[PDB]
Design a protein around this nucleic acid. Structure first.
Lengths: 157, 85
DNA sequence: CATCAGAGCCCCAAA
DNA sequence: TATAATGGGTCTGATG
RNA sequence: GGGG
């Protein structure tokens, strides 16, 4: 199992009063608490690219095939869309219900907050790991130790 | 009874051993190129050290007698190499 | 109480 | 030189 | 297997 290290940037809009301010968020740490259900609405037009992790998910709208928005749905956010769906600007994508917090296998490096009326739009510099499993056969041999950090194109088996 | 002491190989450890053997074979070819010595001689000195000091003898086919003195000189000429060799 | 070494000579025809 | 084959067919007396 |  190769735990592949991805490091991208993604955004999320919360009620300013439900959001607890921190310059970063370690895994499992509370990110906001909402006194009521709040519908995280879309702010761009395009076809959805849902990418569900262990807990918590990603959501990448694209026009043609060029990404135009990258949203991050932490735990406590139930996605109300499906992969490849067409979303118009302002249509609700997910639903937050009370306490939402970072997933366990992903962390927030930097954090940038822009305020806008009664809400905040967080620009999170997220970094996580996506595991991929490989089946090994008797004619083959594993040439890499446990805990060995590999770059792209390296040989594992 | 002695034969029954050694367990039979699994298809994996069968391929692993057969693999390490073939690689070691090539590692002595590529090792005689670097050092500029006789392949057979090198592979004997590799044997001397793996088997132990119990066996040490003049291998007819080889040119230099295999006394503990000349194997230590070739074991040092080996240890004398860069990490990559 | 187990292991080993002893247990007659010479001669014949056969094999 | 390359399917796979992997554990056999008496009788007594002296000495440790 | 016989001889003495």
């Amino acid at each position: 199992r190769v735990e592949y290290v991805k490091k991208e940037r993604a955004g999320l809009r919360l009620p300013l009063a439900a959001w607890v301010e921190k310059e970063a968020y370690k895994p499992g740490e509370i990110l906001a608490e909402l006194p009521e259900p709040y519908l995280f609405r879309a702010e761009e037009e395009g076809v959805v690219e849902l990418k569900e992790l262990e807990e918590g998910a990603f959501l990448v709208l694209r026009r043609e095939d060029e990404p135009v928005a990258t949203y991050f749905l932490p735990v406590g956010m139930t996605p109300l869309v499906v992969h490849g769906e067409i979303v118009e600007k302002g249509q609700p994508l997910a639903e937050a219900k009370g306490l939402l917090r970072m997933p366990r296998q992903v962390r927030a490096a930097q954090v940038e907050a822009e305020e806008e009326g009664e809400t905040v739009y967080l620009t999170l510099f997220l970094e996580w790991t996506e595991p991929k499993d490989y089946r090994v056969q008797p004619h083959m041999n594993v040439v890499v130790p446990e805990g060995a950090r590999v770059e792209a194109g390296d040989k594992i088996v | 009874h002695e034969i029954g002491q050694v367990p039979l190989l699994t298809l994996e450890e069968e391929v692993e051993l057969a693999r390490k053997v073939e690689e070691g074979m090539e590692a002595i070819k590529k090792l005689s190129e670097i050092t500029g010595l006789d392949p057979d001689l090198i592979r004997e000195v590799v044997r001397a050290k793996i088997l132990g000091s119990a066996r040490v003898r003049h291998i007819p086919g080889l040119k230099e007698t295999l006394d503990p003195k000349t194997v230590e000189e070739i074991d040092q000429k080996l240890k004398s190499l860069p990490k990559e060799h």
